[PDB]
Structure formats: structure tokens, C-alpha cells
Amino acid sequence: GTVWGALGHGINLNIPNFQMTDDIDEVRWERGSTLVAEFKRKPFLKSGAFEILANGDLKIKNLTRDDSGTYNVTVYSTNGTRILDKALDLRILE
Amino acid sequence: GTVWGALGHGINLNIPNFQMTDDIDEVRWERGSTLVAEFKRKPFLKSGAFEILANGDLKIKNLTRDDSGTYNVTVYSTNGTRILDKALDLRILE
Numbered sequence A, B: 001g002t003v004w005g006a007l008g009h010g011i012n013l014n015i016p017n018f019q020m021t022d023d024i025d026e027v028r029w030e031r032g033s034t035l036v037a038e039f040k041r042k043p044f045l046k047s048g049a050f051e052i053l054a055n056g057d058l059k060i061k062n063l064t065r066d067d068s069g070t071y072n073v074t075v076y077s078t079n080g081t082r083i084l085d086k087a088l089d090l091r092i093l094e
Helices: none
Strands: A002-006 A011-013 A024-031 A034-040 A050-052 A058-060 A069-077 A082-093 B002-006 B011-013 B024-031 B034-040 B050-052 B058-060 B069-077 B082-093
Touching (some): A050 B034, A082 B011
Antiparallel strands (some): A024 B069, B069 B082
8 A cells, every 4th residue: 555754754664454373473563675673573594493591592403414514693782783603613423 | 621521411591701790782792793682772874863762662763864865674583573564665855
């Protein structure tokens, strides 16, 4: 639909016929190629072979030769300043 | 710097000398160009000119000529499914 705003004023872009429930994982707003806002509750995970622990550690459920390599962890504070950036060379014994 | 795992076993990659607090906004794990896992408590916002409301709506704080256009909202359920995709053409009167 079409919504009207006026200069100097603010406005809320209402998600039509929709209500926020505990069954919603992500709400994403974009304007063209631009990401305006996005909310996501559960963490991103590549697959079920991985998982992130409460302390921030990466759990790799079942190791295979292809899980070896350098893994980079980066932590940002609440105002998004990068307070940590480490590399862990994961070697797998065969 | 070097962590050893073995085939058929799982493993936890430990963030060294780091404790998880309510003050950290995001933890990102990558392996090369692959995003493996990521946690982010706060919502993504382009700038302070915006804010995502508790109901998923997009609030544009102060309207200017450059805020006009089509805004896409997409909502995913707790399991990645897509339950909504609406387009909203915002027009600003001067």
C-alpha cells in the first residue's frame, strides 16, 4: 500500500495485518539495496553441525577432515566497539 | 593459538581470556569467508534516525526528502520460514 508522511515529522511504517509473537525469529526492513533495520532473536548458525554456547564459544558437533582451518572470533560491546578479535587454528587428528 | 580435535569427536572452540557479560552485543565466528555462527542482542539500525519497535514496525524519527520510497518488510518464523513480505511506498508531502 501507500503511506504518507510530512517533512519534519516522524512516522511509523506499520506491518499490515500482522502481530508480533514468540513464534517470530526475524523482522527485516529494507529500502532498495539498503538494510534499514533488522531484528533477529536466535543466533545465526551455518548448520546443525554447529552451535554457539551461552559463553560465546563455538561448538562443532561432529568433526571431519573439512572442519580444520582457522576460525576467527570477534566480540563487539553494546555500542558496537570491537573489543576482541582472535584466531584459533583448528587441527584435526586423523 | 592451535587447538586439536579428532575425527568423530565434537569440540568447543574457547574464546580465550574472555568472559560473557550483559555488556557484549555480538559474538561472531568465521572460518575464511564463511560465517559459521553469530549472536547479536541489539537490532541492526542504519543510524539513530531509525528504530525498530517492539511490534516490528519501523519508526523513522525525522522525515526528509530522501526518506521517501518503497520499504520492504519481511518476517520469518522461529524456524526460518517466511510468513510475510510486504512492500510499503512511503511518500513525503512538502
